[PDB]
Amino acid sequence: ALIENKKAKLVLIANDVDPIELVVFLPALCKKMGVPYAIVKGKARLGTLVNQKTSAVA
Amino acid sequence: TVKTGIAIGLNKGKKVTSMTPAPKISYKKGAASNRTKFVRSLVREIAGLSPYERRLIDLIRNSGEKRARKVAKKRLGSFTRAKAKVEEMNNIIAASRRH
Amino acid sequence: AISKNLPILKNHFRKHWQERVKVHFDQAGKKVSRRNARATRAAKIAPRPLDLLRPVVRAPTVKYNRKVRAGRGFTLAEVKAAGLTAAYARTIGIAVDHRRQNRNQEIFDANVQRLKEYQSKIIVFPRNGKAPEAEQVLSAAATFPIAQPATDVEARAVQDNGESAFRTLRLARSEKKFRGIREKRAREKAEAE
Amino acid sequence: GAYKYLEELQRKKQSDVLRFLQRVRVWEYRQKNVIHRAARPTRPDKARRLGYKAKQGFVIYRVRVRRGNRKRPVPKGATYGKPTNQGVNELKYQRSLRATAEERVGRRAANLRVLNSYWVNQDSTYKYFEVILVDPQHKAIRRDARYNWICDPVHKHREARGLTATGKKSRGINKGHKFNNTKAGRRKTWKRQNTLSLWRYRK
Amino acid sequence: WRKWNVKVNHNEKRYATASAIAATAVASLVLARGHRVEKIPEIPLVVSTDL
Amino acid sequence: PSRFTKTRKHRGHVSAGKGRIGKHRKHPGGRGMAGGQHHHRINMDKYHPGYFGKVGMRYFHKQQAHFWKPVLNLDKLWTLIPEDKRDQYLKSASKETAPVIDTLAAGYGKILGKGRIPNVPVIVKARFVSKLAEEKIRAAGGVVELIA
RNA sequence: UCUUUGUAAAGUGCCUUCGAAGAGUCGAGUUGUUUGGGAAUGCAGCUCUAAGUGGGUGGUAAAUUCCAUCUAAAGCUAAA
RNA sequence: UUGACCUCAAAUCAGGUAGGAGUACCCGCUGAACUUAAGCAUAUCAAUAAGCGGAGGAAAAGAAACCAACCGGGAUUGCCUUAGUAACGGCGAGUGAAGCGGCAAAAGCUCAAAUUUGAAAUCUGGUACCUUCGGUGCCCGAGUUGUAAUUUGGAGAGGGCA
């Protein structure tokens, strides 16, 4: 919802998520919206920065 | 559609001072949105065409639309679904490859 | 097995019909128990009627469109026309129907006047503690009866304009019978090159 | 949110991305047991709209059903009856395969109440389903008044009586003139119109 | 499911009830039915509403 | 009652009114309408001609409320005026005070002209009128007003 | 009779921008069963497989044009 | 080397739950033939008996992807009726509803799909205490692949004013 509102300034995307249908639209939408995006190794590493277990996007 | 007051004919039935009631919000289930137009157009660029949709744009270019509606009636359910599919495939070809 | 001048009967008893015979011996018993259920409900619902306020409504299907029947509920436009919201009107004992619409101004005016007449004849006790007990009326259909609307007068002047009514009906049936063919001829002649 | 994108994207089952996912997943589900516990929904919005919520006591079970017609018993194809009842092969089993999936899962985890189930995959032999079940003894379900209706004793084994969505489909329960034989139950309407009602004063 | 109760037309039941009330008059039918009424003054008779 | 029944009169006599040669059996000629074309043909023709066969066209989902049009003849038509006003309106047979007769609310769909209304002018509220019902109503000085 | 819940919650009016509404499902063909349902009432197997001014229905198959009526593929609910 | 995460196990691990009986009525599955057709094979018997799975004091159904063609009605169930009718049927034997209408009883609704984003506000469990069909404090855990609030189409949501 932040990407659709053109409000996010950076989007880190996990590559590990087991249903990939959750996140396959996240590159393309980010190319549509002009939000820069990086696919980064680790949903666990994303979860550590946000005090969850995994977070799958940040 | 005001009625005549007699029992047969075209507009048969009693004359009544009509009211035209409030429109229900159902009867607007078919209205798309600003949102779902954006979602379905962004899934269409990720998913792409189907094996029968990829064949349908070959039949339109190489054999015209009567041969593609005949196929799309066989692929989809009825004929009125084939009309709405071949025009969508005409919206694919005309938008991208020409202009 | 077929012998006399007797009419051909169709008695549908070739199944195991004797296992499904329901004799109603408890007609008197269910009548008494039903009256006792109504008395117990009138005790629990102690100042209120047993029923809700129903609307004047017009029955369908030309066999019955001459008749006015009690309807289900009071159609949020009719509730709003009588100056009260739907959720409150449900608690004041007026039945509300979201499905029924208003296409008829006479039935609309009848149901809104039913609502004004109901509001002018009931008292709602305030919520906390006062409750000045006031002798419940069991039926709301009794106090606010569905009145069949009068359509005309008993005496009038005979106004013979000259034209027939049988020819009016026969021309209406003719005009309906040939509308599509006359439109077809209009399209086939309007295709004048 | 993401669930609209997933809801539209799980409709293009002939596109390349979804058929690659269907091939990989239909291998993987085939490698495991017939009835096995799924740790999370693979279709989280399709599960979510069928009643699932990611709290404790909501369980997903994946299940595998053999496709095709129902071949009759009574050995060597001999039916011993009229020539109309002699058909052994093309008989069709009036319940869905999804209802049989719900039945087998509700039989294995009998302490859980079957909420819904949905299609995920298929190959030639097997159809694949995921069943969402509710735990009626969990205190995250006995409280939370949106969902404690399932803790009533009347919703014991809804999938075995035909009370789920595929069960109310395959029982024919619908409003309409198209559903006159089974609108309030097939046998109930048949018993109602195949009885002789006699009053005290015979009409 | 044998027939136990019997329909009678309501006008016929009222006919029979009126004939019975009319037969509670003159004491030949009352004497012929039982009813030791040989020494009451009238045939049917009333009484004050104090009863 | 069984007391007044001829089974109390065949006590003592052997075959109970069924014959010695005939010997009342279970079903000697079939069951029900069995054999109407073969051994019960002389009963089917002669007392039921027209039983077998098909006539006409089918009507899927026929509703008998579409065809609701009960008829009223010109014979009565004054029974729809009450008796206290019937003698009042029969005399003073004139226009400008004429009885409006609501035949639809009376429960009729069609007026038919079977015969001989009095010469009073009346006002008939109908849906369907025949020819002769309208001619005789107008010959008495009245009109028919078609309603729905 | 005792707490005051609470710088909480709810309902009404006008203007404006919107208004997300359920997919191997709907629907179609075929097969079997069933129905009063008849060019196919319902259900089920297989094959194909949607849309969004859309879809279902309107008891004769089809094409073209209209109209009317609901809002499916998720769920709860006493009483007769 | 260490600490995660995902997935999968193990335990006489802490707490629970299922089986069986009864089954008149109820929800499904599966499913005959005798019989009738004066034979018999479609049909009928019968969408029944037997068999199997599953509930409750009722069950089921249920707030319309309904009925209609009206001046339109309005969740479901049931009775009178429609009606032995429309229709089905070696159009043979036979079968056979539904809409309207009168009545009994009447009751309504909630999720998914919206960013709380200026603060996961939500919840199980453990332990301590207390006023114990539970509450409060503390702490692990669930959970951002989404629990609360808001909204359910009859609408409703966001701004502005009243």
Q: With touching defined as 3+ CB pairs under 8 A, do chains E and F touch?
A: no
Does residue C191 sit in helix, strand or coil? Answer: coil
**Contact status, residue C158 vs residue F139, Cβ threshold 8 Å:** no
- Reading the block at residue D152, the tokens are 């009533």
- Reading the block at residue D20, the tokens are 């690659």
Nucleotide nearest the Cα atom of D48 (by C1')? H112
Distance CA F10, CA E45 (A): 53
State the smallest CA–CA distance between residue D93 and chain A in angstroms: 34
Using a CB-CB cut-off of 8 Å, the residues of chain B touching A28 are: 42, 45-46
For E48, other C-beta atoms within 10 Å of its C-beta total 5
- For nucleotide H144, the protein residue with its alpha carbon nearest to C1' is A55
Å between E1 CA and H40 C1'? 38
For C6, other C-beta atoms within 10 Å of its C-beta total 10
Torsional sign, CA F101, F104, F108, F110: positive
Return the bridge partners of D58, or none.
Answer: D134
State the smallest CA–CA distance between residue D41 and chain A in angstroms: 9
Listing DSSP states for C26-63 in one string gives THHHHHHHHHHHHHHHHHHTTTS-SSPBPPEEE--TTT
Residue type for position A52: Q
Å between C59 CA and G70 C1'? 20
Give the residue on B whose Cα is nearest the Cα of D18. B47
Lookup result for tokens 């990989």:
D24
**Contact status, residue A31 vs residue A11, Cβ threshold 8 Å:** no
**For chain C, what is the radius of gyration of the CA atoms?**
28
Give the residue on B whose Cα is nearest the Cα of A31. B42
Tell me the pairing of strands D58-66 and D35-38: antiparallel
Torsional sign, CA B4, B6, B11, B13: positive
Cβ-count burial F84-105 (b if 16+ within 10 Å, e if not): eeeeebeeeeebeebbbbbbbb
Distance CA B50, CA C109 (A): 58
Q: Which long-range contacts (CB under 8 A, 24 or more apart) does D30-35 make?
A: D30/D64, D30/D123, D30/D126, D32/D62, D34/D63, D34/D64, D34/D104, D35/D61, D35/D62, D35/D63, D35/D64, D35/D104, D35/D105, D35/D108
Å between D154 CA and H23 C1'? 16
Q: Which of A1, A18, A24 sits opposite D1 (nearest CB)?
A: A1
Residue to substitute from D8, D11, D17, D19, interface B, most B β-carbons within 10 A: D8
Return phi, psi of residue C140, to 5°: -90, -20
C-alpha to C-alpha distances, A55 to A17, A41, D86, D110, D151, nearest whole angstrom: 10, 12, 60, 33, 33
C-alpha to C-alpha distances, A12 to D42, F17, F112, nearest whole angstrom: 22, 104, 88
**Contact status, residue D162 vs residue D171, Cβ threshold 8 Å:** yes
- Note whether C88 contacts D: Cβ–Cβ < 8 A: no
- Note whether D16 contacts B: Cβ–Cβ < 8 A: yes
Q: Which long-range contacts (CB under 8 A, 24 or more apart) does C78-87 make?
A: C78/C102, C78/C108, C78/C111, C78/C112, C78/C115, C79/C115, C81/C108, C81/C112, C81/C115, C82/C112, C82/C115, C82/C116, C82/C119, C84/C115, C84/C119
- Reading the block at residue D129, the tokens are 């389903």
- For nucleotide H53, the protein residue with its alpha carbon nearest to C1' is D160
Query: Which H or E run contains F20?
Result: none
Distance CA A2, CA A34 (A): 12
List, in order, residues 6 or more apart from D49 with CB less than 8 Å away.
D7
For C109, other C-beta atoms within 10 Å of its C-beta total 14
Distance of CA F146 to the CA centre of its chain: 25
Distance CA D128, CA D64 (A): 5
Distance of CA D162 to the CA centre of its chain: 8
Cβ of B42 within 8 Å of Cβ of A24? The answer is no
Cβ of B46 within 8 Å of Cβ of D9? The answer is yes
Distance CA F42, CA C8 (A): 15
**Contact status, residue D182 vs residue D120, Cβ threshold 8 Å:** no
- Note whether C12 contacts D: Cβ–Cβ < 8 A: no
Å between C43 CA and H64 C1'? 35
State the smallest CA–CA distance between residue F38 and chain C in angstroms: 11
- Reading the block at residue F107, the tokens are 């429960």
Beta strands in chain F (DSSP E): 71-73, 98-102, 110-112, 123-126, 128-129, 143-146
Tell me the pairing of strands F71-73 and F110-112: parallel
For E43, other C-beta atoms within 10 Å of its C-beta total 14
Smallest CA-to-CA distance from F107 within F142, F66, F68 is with F68
The reported resolution of this PDB entry, expressed in Å, is 3.3
Cβ-count burial F34-72 (b if 16+ within 10 Å, e if not): ebbeeebeebbeeeeeeeeeeeeeeeeeeeeeeeeeeeb
Using a CB-CB cut-off of 8 Å, the residues of chain D touching C17 are: 194, 196
- Note whether B42 contacts A: Cβ–Cβ < 8 A: yes
Listing DSSP states for C76-144 in one string gives HHHHHHTT--HHHHHHTTB---SS----BHHHHHHHHHHHHHHHTT-----SSS--------S-HHHHS
Smallest CA-to-CA distance from F40 within E12, C8, B52 is with C8
- DSSP category for residue C149: P
Does residue A25 sit in helix, strand or coil? Answer: helix
Tell me the pairing of strands A11-14 and A37-40: parallel
Return phi, psi of residue F145, to 5°: -105, 115
List, in order, residues 6 or more apart from C76 with CB less than 8 Å away.
C86, C96, C98
Cβ of E1 within 8 Å of Cβ of D201? The answer is no
Lookup result for tokens 């249908």:
A21
Return phi, psi of residue B43, to 5°: -75, -30
- Note whether D197 contacts B: Cβ–Cβ < 8 A: no
- Note whether E39 contacts D: Cβ–Cβ < 8 A: no
Residues 3 through 32 of chain E touching chain D, CB cutoff 8 Å: 3-7
**Contact status, residue C76 vs residue C100, Cβ threshold 8 Å:** no
Listing DSSP states for B26-41 in one string gives TT-SS---SHHHHHHH
List, in order, residues 6 or more apart from E4 with CB less than 8 Å away.
D200
- Reading the block at residue D150, the tokens are 């399932």
Nucleotide nearest the Cα atom of D98 (by C1')? G44
- Note whether B35 contacts F: Cβ–Cβ < 8 A: no
State the number of CA atoms in the 13 A half-sphere of F110 facing the CB.
14
Tell me the pairing of strands C21-23 and A11-14: unpaired
Lookup result for tokens 């109440």:
D113
Angle (nearest 5°) at CA F9 between F6 and F10: 100
Distance CA B74, CA F120 (A): 72
Distance of CA C188 to the CA centre of its chain: 48
CB-based burial label for D90 (10 Å; 0-12, 13-18, 19+): exposed
Å between D95 CA and H50 C1'? 22
**Contact status, residue B82 vs residue D45, Cβ threshold 8 Å:** no
**Contact status, residue D127 vs residue D89, Cβ threshold 8 Å:** no
Distance of CA B65 to the CA centre of its chain: 17
**Contact status, residue B46 vs residue B35, Cβ threshold 8 Å:** no
